[PDB]
Design a protein around this ligand. Structure first.
Ligand SMILES: O=C1NC(=O)[C@](CNC(=O)c2cc3cc(Cl)ccc3o2)(c2nccs2)N1
Ligand SMILES: [Ca+2]
Ligand SMILES: [Ca+2]
Ligand SMILES: [Ca+2]
Ligand SMILES: [Zn+2]
Length: 214
């Protein structure tokens, strides 16, 4: 029942250049806020996002293309992991924060990208986030929602699960998130199905040494 995502957090050289000595505290603050969203009852099946490893940056190729940056990061992070979840150095997902302005095919409006429904596949359990300096925890929550198999709330399946009456984490673009319902019914259904179907089998072990905000 209790689920734990052992998370590797990675910050690129641009993050280090900007945030400097306060970077570690900043990343843990961002991740604490994302973790709070994943415990909210609206998600139906809460999970504990636990930072277990923190890397401040050869490394991954970071550039304008969100797609290519994600692929490069996901290839790179594989090398840091271990084969077995029982090894304390093993992690369940990897998230990169960058100051790079990430882009799609026609615009640079995107703030992140992730593989969908990949949380317990070490080869694919990856997300990237463009650090905007204020709302990065919401972007991280959106990308981790995708990692947990969530769709956007304007997708056809979500229409039928959400009802007729853009205020949630899995909105297709960032808008003001409802504090009483960060996750739509569609998001709750998709993460619940995902875990019920056995795709969260790597989330059952408790981490030994979480990184805590002191
Ligand atoms: O993860 C992604 N889904 C996408 O459609 C997008 C763009 N959206 C965001 O960056 C983004 C961040 C965010 C935060 C909240 Cl609270 C709600 C919605 C949000 O959307 C891409 N477009 C093209 C390639 S990737 N990235
Ligand atoms: Ca483990
Ligand atoms: Ca961008
Ligand atoms: Ca695990
Ligand atoms: Zn999305």
């Amino acid at each position: 029942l209790s689920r734990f995502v052992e998370t590797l957090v990675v910050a690129d050289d641009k993050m280090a250049a900007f945030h400097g000595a306060g970077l570690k505290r900043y990343l843990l603050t961002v991740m604490a806020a994302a973790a709070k969203a994943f415990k909210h009852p609206s998600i139906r099946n809460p999970v504990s996002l636990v930072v277990t490893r923190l890397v401040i940056l050869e490394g991954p190729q970071v550039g304008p293309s969100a797609a290519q940056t994600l692929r490069s990061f996901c290839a790179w992070q594989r090398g840091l992991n271990t084969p077995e979840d029982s090894d304390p150095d093993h992690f369940d997902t990897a998230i990169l924060f960058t100051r790079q302005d990430l882009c799609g095919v026609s615009t640079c409006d995107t703030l992140g990208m992730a593989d969908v429904g990949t949380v317990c596949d070490p080869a694919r359990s990856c997300a990237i986030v463009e650090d905007d300096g204020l709302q990065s925890a919401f972007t991280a929550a959106h990308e981790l929602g995708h990692v947990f198999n969530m769709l956007h709330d304007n997708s056809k399946p979500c229409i039928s699960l959400n009802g007729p009456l853009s205020r949630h984490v899995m909105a297709p673009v960032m808008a003001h998130v409802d504090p009483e319902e960060p996750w739509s019914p569609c998001s709750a259904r998709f993460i619940t199905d995902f875990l019920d179907n056995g795709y969260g089998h790597c989330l059952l072990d408790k981490p030994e040494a979480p990184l805590h905000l002191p």
